[PDB]
Amino acid sequence: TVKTGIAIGLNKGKKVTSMTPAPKISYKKGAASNRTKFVRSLVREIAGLSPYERRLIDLIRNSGEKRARKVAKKRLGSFTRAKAKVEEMNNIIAASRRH
Amino acid sequence: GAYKYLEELQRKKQSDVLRFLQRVRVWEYRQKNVIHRAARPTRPDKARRLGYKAKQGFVIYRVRVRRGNRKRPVPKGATYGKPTNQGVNELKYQRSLRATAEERVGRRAANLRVLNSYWVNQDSTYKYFEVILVDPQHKAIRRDARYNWICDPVHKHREARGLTATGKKSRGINKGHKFNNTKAGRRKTWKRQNTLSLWRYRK
Amino acid sequence: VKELLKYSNETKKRNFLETVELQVGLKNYDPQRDKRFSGSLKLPNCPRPNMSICIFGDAFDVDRAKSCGVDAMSVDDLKKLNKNKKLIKKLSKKYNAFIASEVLIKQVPRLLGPQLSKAGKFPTPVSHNDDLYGKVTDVRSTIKFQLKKVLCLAVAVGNVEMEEDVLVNQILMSVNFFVSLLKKNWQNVGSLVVKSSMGPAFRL
RNA sequence: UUGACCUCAAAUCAGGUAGGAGUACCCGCUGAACUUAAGCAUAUCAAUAAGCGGAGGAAAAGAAACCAACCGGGAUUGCCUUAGUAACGGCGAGUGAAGCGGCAAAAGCUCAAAUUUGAAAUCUGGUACCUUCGGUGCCCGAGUUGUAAUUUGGAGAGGG
RNA sequence: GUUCUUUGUAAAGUGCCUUCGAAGAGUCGAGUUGUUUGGGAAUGCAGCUCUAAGUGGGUGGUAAAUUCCAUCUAAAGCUAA
RNA sequence: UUGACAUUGUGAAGAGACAUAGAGGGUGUAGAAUAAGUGGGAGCUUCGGCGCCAGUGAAAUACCACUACCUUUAUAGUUUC
């Protein structure tokens, strides 16, 4: 990112020649793979949903996503987990009911 | 492998399928004893990540533990102190149900050096776990450069101390500024700063 | 995408059985409420002709009366102030200017209920006349919401070409998606049912 | 009818192992009161004594889901400094750390997650002899609801 | 130091390219109950209810939306001085 | 003791929203008349029925996208008690 070469500034640091080596294997622990993608949707058609996930999709198709994030946040945890949860259930509403 | 499948399957317990299988087996353990030997492990996927090899010396156990909290054993409610110190039903425990169950099966089979265990069932009155123990008596397990540490007296009753996973999470033997008070030997470290040490010379 | 189905491109030029020139509507899906703030109330500016012959009532004076007979409709002056005062409303909309705001005192008695006059809420008075004519006959789409969460407008024609009307519904997929308030729901570009006035509807 | 499989049994069958002691030093759970605040109810004492359970000669721990914001350091511990500070607190009495710097001391790793599948190649016990902490023939069973070989992110493997 | 069996159609190490590349779930977290603490919109820890994901998740000592950078890899274990 | 939730499930009736396609009726006086009612409309169509350049009102009809207000009007799946 390059520094200012001085004590402070928007870049508080020293102007040194960067080496930057090949990054670790501990960076792609969020990698899915064909092994997982496969089984994940396979066991999902076998297990399916639950009672909270049933009235969760009928909350979106009946009301909205602002209201469905307002339920799953008290149903689960963070607003970050709520964003991810609704993305999932919407690819099941569009790609199952229409496709 | 069946492990990759069985593993993610036991993560979606919120499904109607697992809750039927559960209802059957939970009643089954309920029609047994409080402590009894289980012939075959129900989760060889979770059992194998703990360290499971099918053969002589591998004792699987089932525990039917009660829940709730710890009611102080004072007759009538007899206390004697300060109100902040005078609690009764708002009393808990510094240990988890998991950890504690392992300790009771160890007072039973003391010739065995228990490994760990995992959650299997639970309704409301009881909680259920599937324990794993190893017997350092068999030459099969006595030798082998995989379990040698067990046969030594340094691994005699790991659950009684908390040298086990659940006990090391409760005992807080973790890295961090949040686990600073109890990094390793809460009391030793406590007593460490509570020590007034002076050299031959007073600086 | 827009390159596949008709939408406003190719496919529906084997479906029409009419002799006249009709304008097609484009239905979109955008969840909004019953209040007075959530919605896309703007003016989606199109580039090329929509051939919707909505005859005007352009009244200009001096050198603005001459630059009114090429791309625009009716050519009028400042003498035609007592022209449409009676009962005649043979104009979908009008268009005044800098020399017609002083003559905008006698063209107000018969244009109140509907309001097709030249006010200050929907752009009518301009000194650049032969510039805003390629925005009213070419059609700069008129919008104004009612009570529910759906909305139709206007693009162009289908008796022309393919890559000349693919830029007409291009600055519309980014115009009813921007003014569309932050008080809306899941996807501002979803359900697409494109019905003209005789044939079937194609979806994307 | 004969023979298995699953699960639960019986014996003075075989072969083993457990309890109790001690408890100076270490690892848990439970848990005080006195005292102080010139009273005393939070608080402090104290996360102490006793009590209950577990070890060894040290013991526990440990190779980061760490500490940092450096031109970043780099498992555990101990000592000097930090600093009696940051913070805590009838913001009261009081209580109360850490990274770093210096240094002693210094050690690394292995299991699940994979088709050995052109081959359960792996291991117990009996019994024969022996070179007897152990080697090897022969016979059962374990065990395929998964034992060797290989590989644990710092990678690394199927291929060439 | 002296001496006996060839370890072996054994294995280890490196160089180039391709495909890939699985890293522990009634756990994490959250609300709340209580407790310990230097921990202050909650320091850890246990209870009960809810109940996760994979360009993911933990943490950046003030809660939160929002767009980001750093930084590692829990939920298995073993080791002297 | 009282409420709440976990434990804690299978149905039946009765009221009942909803996702969905058809259908249906509302400004009483004028305009022979069925108006909160918008945009396209001179034609959609082997007819021509209305139209319509026309006309009246607070407001023009088949060609009607339904973008609608509305239906405790019939249902192909779930729902609160």
Swiss-Prot record, chain A:
GO terms for molecular function: RNA binding; structural constituent of ribosome. The keyword Transport does not apply. It is found in: Cytoplasm. GO terms for biological process: cytoplasmic translation. The modification N-acetylthreonine is found at residue 1. Component of the large ribosomal subunit (LSU). Mature yeast ribosomes consist of a small (40S) and a large (60S) subunit. The 40S small subunit contains 1 molecule of ribosomal RNA (18S rRNA) and 33 different proteins (encoded by 57 genes). The large 60S subunit contains 3 rRNA molecules (25S, 5.8S and 5S rRNA) and 46 different proteins (encoded by 81 genes). Belongs to the eukaryotic ribosomal protein eL36 family. Component of the ribosome, a large ribonucleoprotein complex responsible for the synthesis of proteins in the cell. The small ribosomal subunit (SSU) binds messenger RNAs (mRNAs) and translates the encoded message by selecting cognate aminoacyl-transfer RNA (tRNA) molecules. The large subunit (LSU) contains the ribosomal catalytic site termed the peptidyl transferase center (PTC), which catalyzes the formation of peptide bonds, thereby polymerizing the amino acids delivered by tRNAs into a polypeptide chain. This is Large ribosomal subunit protein eL36A. It comes from Saccharomyces cerevisiae (strain ATCC 204508 / S288c) (Baker's yeast). The lineage of its organism: Eukaryota, Fungi, Dikarya, Ascomycota, Saccharomycotina. The gene is RPL36A.
UniProtKB/Swiss-Prot annotation, chain B:
Its main location: cytoplasm. Residues 163-184 are annotated as: Disordered. GO terms for biological process: cytoplasmic translation. Pfam families: Ribosomal_L15e (PF00827). It is found in: Cytoplasm. Residues 168-184 have a biased composition (Basic residues). One of its GO terms (cellular component) is cytosolic large ribosomal subunit. InterPro entries: Rbsml_eL15_core_dom_sf, Ribosomal_eL15, Ribosomal_eL15_CS, Ribosomal_uL23/eL15/eS24_sf. One of its GO terms (molecular function) is RNA binding. Keywords: Cytoplasm, Ribonucleoprotein, Ribosomal protein. There are 2 genes for eL15 in yeast. Component of the ribosome, a large ribonucleoprotein complex responsible for the synthesis of proteins in the cell. The small ribosomal subunit (SSU) binds messenger RNAs (mRNAs) and translates the encoded message by selecting cognate aminoacyl-transfer RNA (tRNA) molecules. The large subunit (LSU) contains the ribosomal catalytic site termed the peptidyl transferase center (PTC), which catalyzes the formation of peptide bonds, thereby polymerizing the amino acids delivered by tRNAs into a polypeptide chain. PANTHER family: LARGE RIBOSOMAL SUBUNIT PROTEIN EL15 (PTHR11847:SF4), RIBOSOMAL PROTEIN L15 (PTHR11847). Component of the large ribosomal subunit (LSU). Mature yeast ribosomes consist of a small (40S) and a large (60S) subunit. The 40S small subunit contains 1 molecule of ribosomal RNA (18S rRNA) and 33 different proteins (encoded by 57 genes). The large 60S subunit contains 3 rRNA molecules (25S, 5.8S and 5S rRNA) and 46 different proteins (encoded by 81 genes). Belongs to the eukaryotic ribosomal protein eL15 family. This is Large ribosomal subunit protein eL15A.
Swiss-Prot record, chain C:
The modification Phosphoserine is found at residues 67, 74. Keywords: Acetylation, Cytoplasm, Methylation, Phosphoprotein, Ribonucleoprotein, Ribosomal protein. GO terms for molecular function: RNA binding; structural constituent of ribosome. N-terminally acetylated by acetyltransferase NatA. GO terms for cellular component: cytosol; cytosolic large ribosomal subunit. InterPro entries: eL8/uL1-like, Ribosomal_uL1, Ribosomal_uL1-like, Ribosomal_uL1/biogenesis, Ribosomal_uL1_3-a/b-sand, Ribosomal_uL1_CS. Its main location: cytoplasm. The modification N6-methyllysine is found at residue 35. One of its GO terms (biological process) is cytoplasmic translation. It is found in: Cytoplasm. Component of the large ribosomal subunit (LSU). Mature yeast ribosomes consist of a small (40S) and a large (60S) subunit. The 40S small subunit contains 1 molecule of ribosomal RNA (18S rRNA) and 33 different proteins (encoded by 57 genes). The large 60S subunit contains 3 rRNA molecules (25S, 5.8S and 5S rRNA) and 46 different proteins (encoded by 81 genes). uL1 forms part of the L1 stalk. Component of the ribosome, a large ribonucleoprotein complex responsible for the synthesis of proteins in the cell. The small ribosomal subunit (SSU) binds messenger RNAs (mRNAs) and translates the encoded message by selecting cognate aminoacyl-transfer RNA (tRNA) molecules. The large subunit (LSU) contains the ribosomal catalytic site termed the peptidyl transferase center (PTC), which catalyzes the formation of peptide bonds, thereby polymerizing the amino acids delivered by tRNAs into a polypeptide chain. PANTHER family: RIBOSOMAL PROTEIN L7AE FAMILY MEMBER (PTHR23105). Belongs to the universal ribosomal protein uL1 family. Present with 116000 molecules/cell in log phase SD medium. There are 2 genes for uL1 in yeast. This is Large ribosomal subunit protein uL1A. It comes from Saccharomyces cerevisiae (strain ATCC 204508 / S288c).
